[PDB]
Amino acid sequence: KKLRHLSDGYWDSAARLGVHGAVLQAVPGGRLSAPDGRVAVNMSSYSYLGLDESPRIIDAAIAALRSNMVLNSSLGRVRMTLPLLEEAECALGDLFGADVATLNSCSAAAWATLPVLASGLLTDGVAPVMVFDKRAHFCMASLKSLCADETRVETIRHNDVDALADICRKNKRVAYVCDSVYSTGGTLAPLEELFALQKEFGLFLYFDEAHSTSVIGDMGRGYVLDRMGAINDSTMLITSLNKGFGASGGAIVFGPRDDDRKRKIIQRSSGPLMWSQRLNTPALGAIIESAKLHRSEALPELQAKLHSNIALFDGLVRAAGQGNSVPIRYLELGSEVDTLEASAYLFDNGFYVEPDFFPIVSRGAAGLRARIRSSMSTADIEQFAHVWHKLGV
Amino acid sequence: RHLSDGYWDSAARLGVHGAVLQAVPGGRLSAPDGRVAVNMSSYSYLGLDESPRIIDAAIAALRSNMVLNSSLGRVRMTLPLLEEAECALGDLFGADVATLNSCSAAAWATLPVLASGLLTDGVAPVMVFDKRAHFCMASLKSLCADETRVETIRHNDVDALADICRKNKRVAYVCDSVYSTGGTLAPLEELFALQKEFGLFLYFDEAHSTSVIGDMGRGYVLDRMGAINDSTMLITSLNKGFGASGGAIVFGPRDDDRKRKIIQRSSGPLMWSQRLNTPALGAIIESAKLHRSEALPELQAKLHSNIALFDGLVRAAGQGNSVPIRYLELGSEVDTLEASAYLFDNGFYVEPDFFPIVSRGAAGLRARIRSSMSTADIEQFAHVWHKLGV
Ligand SMILES: *Cc1c(COP(=O)(O)O)cnc(C)c1O
Numbered sequence: 001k002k003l004r005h006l007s008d009g010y011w012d013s014a015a016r017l018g019v020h021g022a023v024l025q026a027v028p029g030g031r032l033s034a035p036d037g038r039v040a041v042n043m044s045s046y047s048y049l050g051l052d053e054s055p056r057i058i059d060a061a062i063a064a065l066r067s068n069m070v071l072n073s074s075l076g077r078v079r080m081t082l083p084l085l086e087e088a089e090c091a092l093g094d095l096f097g098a099d100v101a102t103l104n105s106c107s108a109a110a111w112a113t114l115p116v117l118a119s120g121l122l123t124d125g126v127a128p129v130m131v132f133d134k135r136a137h138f139c140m141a142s143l144k145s146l147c148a149d150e151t152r153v154e155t156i157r158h159n160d161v162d163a164l165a166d167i168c169r170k171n172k173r174v175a176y177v178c179d180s181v182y183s184t185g186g187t188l189a190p191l192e193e194l195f196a197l198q199k200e201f202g203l204f205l206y207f208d209e210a211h212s213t214s215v216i217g218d219m220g221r222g223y224v225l226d227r228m229g230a231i232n233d234s235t236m237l238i239t240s241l242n243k244g245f246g247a248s249g250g251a252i253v254f255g256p257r258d259d260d261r262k263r264k265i266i267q268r269s270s271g272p273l274m275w276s277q278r279l280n281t282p283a284l285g286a287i288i289e290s291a292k293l294h295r296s297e298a299l300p301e302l303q304a305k306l307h308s309n310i311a312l313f314d315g316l317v318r319a320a321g322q323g324n325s326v327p328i329r330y331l332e333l334g335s336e337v338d339t340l341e342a343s344a345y346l347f348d349n350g351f352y353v354e355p356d357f358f359p360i361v362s363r364g365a366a367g368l369r370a371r372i373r374s375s376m377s378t379a380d381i382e383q384f385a386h387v388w389h390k391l392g393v
Numbered sequence: 394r395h396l397s398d399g400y401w402d403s404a405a406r407l408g409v410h411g412a413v414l415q416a417v418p419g420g421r422l423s424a425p426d427g428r429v430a431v432n433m434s435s436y437s438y439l440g441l442d443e444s445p446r447i448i449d450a451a452i453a454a455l456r457s458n459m460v461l462n463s464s465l466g467r468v469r470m471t472l473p474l475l476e477e478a479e480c481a482l483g484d485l486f487g488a489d490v491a492t493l494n495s496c497s498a499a500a501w502a503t504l505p506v507l508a509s510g511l512l513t514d515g516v517a518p519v520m521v522f523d524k525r526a527h528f529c530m531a532s533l534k535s536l537c538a539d540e541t542r543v544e545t546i547r548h549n550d551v552d553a554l555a556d557i558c559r560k561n562k563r564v565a566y567v568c569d570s571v572y573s574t575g576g577t578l579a580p581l582e583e584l585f586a587l588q589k590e591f592g593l594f595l596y597f598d599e600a601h602s603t604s605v606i607g608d609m610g611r612g613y614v615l616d617r618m619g620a621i622n623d624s625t626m627l628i629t630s631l632n633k634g635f636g637a638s639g640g641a642i643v644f645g646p647r648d649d650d651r652k653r654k655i656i657q658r659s660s661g662p663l664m665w666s667q668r669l670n671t672p673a674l675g676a677i678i679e680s681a682k683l684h685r686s687e688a689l690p691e692l693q694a695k696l697h698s699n700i701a702l703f704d705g706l707v708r709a710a711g712q713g714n715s716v717p718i719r720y721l722e723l724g725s726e727v728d729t730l731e732a733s734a735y736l737f738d739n740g741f742y743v744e745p746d747f748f749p750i751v752s753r754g755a756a757g758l759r760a761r762i763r764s765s766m767s768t769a770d771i772e773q774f775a776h777v778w779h780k781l782g783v
Pocket residue numbers: 275276277278494495496497498527529569573598599600601629630631633639640
């Protein structure tokens with residue numbers, strides 16, 4: 001309706017204040033430059049382990065492109081793949097202990113997998129009831145209508161395991177579509193309950209891991225796999241590989257490494273995994289190098305640095321999430337106009353913090369979405385806390 | 394389906410599906426055993442996937458920026474490289490252009506909002522899909538159906554489309570510019586006549602038309618239309634002939650930012666899905682420079698001569714087209730798989746299309762002509778293919 005006038009004004013206002021839609025150059029040190037030349041620390045980068053600045057990863061991307069001398073990793077888009085692609089998927093498979101396919105985005109992964117899960121081909125031919133968590137990322141939830149073409153679709157309230165329990169008792173086959181780590185709300189998927197229902201009813205678990213992989217778990221295998229240990233044949237993960245894994249694209253984690261069936265079924269479906277371009281060679285080079293990194297001691301070190309930085313920030317600034325180990329923080333200011341001016345003020349003083357405003361969030365619930373990363377120094381956070389408290393005076 | 398999957402297994406077992414080959418210069422593939430073959434099914438129509446200018450620009454962009462992401466750790470900001478790439482494509486097509494990580498993502502970000510009427514003055518149009526619209530759009534009908542009426546008409550049936558225009562206040566027609574199966578083209582003269590008469594909104598997937606067709610390679614629709622109007626939208630893939638990576642929305646005229654802002658502010662992949670990395674954007678910039686230089690008409694001349702050469706030596710569905718796509722119908726899926734297996738051993742990969750890719754009993758090899766084929770390449774192929782009749 002006419003809230004569209006309201007939302008457009010916020011977008012228009014964000015752009016006018018320079019807190020949205022600016023052209024900034026990536027500066028070493030989690031920093032952003034500007035045409036004027038001013039530098040700002042990026043307090044909202046999604047590269048949670050700072051791997052976007054890894055010389056190791058960038059040089060493997062350059063090497064892969066230079067030694068294959070082709071961008072595309074298909075052979076001119078025919079149904080054949082470069083050795084580089086098989087190596088990258090083998091590398092992701094070793095890391096995750098699972099059969100893994102790459103795609104050009106996590107969103108493509110969801111498009112390739114959800115309508116298949118809905119049809120029944122992944123669950124012994126029984127079309128499951130597709131149960132969507134209300135807070136599931138839009139790359140999944142915007143596809144309910146394709147799922148509806150295949151089966152009954154339900155949406156439950158956030159983490160309502162009891163309603164899920166009911167649906168399981170009422171139907172032969174059920175699937176649960178959710179995020180591992182929700183970026184707003186600070187919540188997590190209820191893994192203990194979900195695994196109990198999967199044990200009791202054979203519930204299919206489908207997790208979007210984009211904010212989980214790298215930041216959580218041994219070797220950054222992520223929230224689900226850390227608790228789970230070895231994936232089973234009733235659990236599927238999609239994830240993005242350019243938020244902290246430090247490369248490009250997304251990925252499907254089909255299930256166990258020694259079972260080709262789910263990959264075969266999904267590869268032979270009509271979806272992006274069949275007819276949408278594979279990752280280019282620099283991206284695949286970067287995934288291989290990051291996979292090695294994730295298996296090295298580099299990874300627990302970066303995770304120690306990250307939790308160190310979370311503790312620092314939480315000790316100096318109060319924000320929703322304070323005390324979590326998910327490096328996402330919400331500085332709620334309520335007023336869309338205040339959030340915007342706070343964002344503009346902080347940028348002028350060396351710190352970019354992205355403003356969330358309606359439609360992105362509820363009306364009267366606007367605020368600054370900060371993200372903690374390994375590549376923040378102790379100076380960066382302490383000086384940010386100093387500028388943030390000076391604004392409150 | 395089990396038969397189709399049974400066909401998939403043989404294809405893989407024969408080594409004509411799902412094998413691992415290395416790219417070899419000259420449009421070639423090297424197997425593990427050193428067997429080198431000519432790829433007769435590559436989609437790099439102008440040979441630009443072997444352009445050393447483009448490949449170096451890709452390397453250069455990655456080394457100057459020292460990051461992969463073209464966002465700033467995915468905040469709602471962009472590297473100068475991304476703006477330069479979208480301005481390069483804006484100069485080339487004479488239109489407001491956004492990049493995306495794929496043409497599929499371009500369809501996902503645009504078709505729901507077009508269905509909603511946000512792009513047609515608040516009036517939800519009737520969404521009419523050509524029968525042969527590519528899957529990346531056709532598989533999104535249900536999302537369109539949540540916003541308005543969806544219709545699928547017979548392929549290129551401009552009369553059924555005209556009946557719809559007369560019976561509804563606003564209609565949008567979703568189709569391909571160039572169809573890869575059937576060799577057909579979008580009836581541009583009819584479609585534009587309906588648009589001038591009814592305000593029909595035209596949505597073109599230009600994936601097989603970018604670079605191949607048109608002065609400077611602006612594609613089929615823009616070469617005839619000249620300048621894009623406010624009722625015409627394009628989506629295209631940039632890794633098929635353009636020689637780069639990703640895909641792009643062609644919103645409309647360069648001077649109107651309203652469709653871009655509406656799309657960007659909508660809940661879709663253009664907002665929430667990662668932008669192209671820096672080597673791809675560098676490639677896009679360099680290839681755009683190439684598409685405005687004299688190298689593009691030269692490569693197109695080379696392509697048409699290869700099509701003519703092929704058409705004279707080999708009888709194939711499409712023969713006579715100016716579209717570099719040909720189908721060697723063999724009917725039997727097994728004959729198609731054996732013929733593919735045979736040609737690859739004698740130096741030529743042609744991909745086999747079997748059920749479910751195509752109908753039962755309409756299996757065949759799908760050849761594509763590119764600028765990077767030599768005369769010798771095509772002459773030798775026609776011989777090995779004619780010898781197979783023996
Ligand atoms: C290649 C193709 C697509 C998909 O392109 P991607 O960029 O790989 O997602 C869409 N439409 C047509 C006609 C295509 O040929």
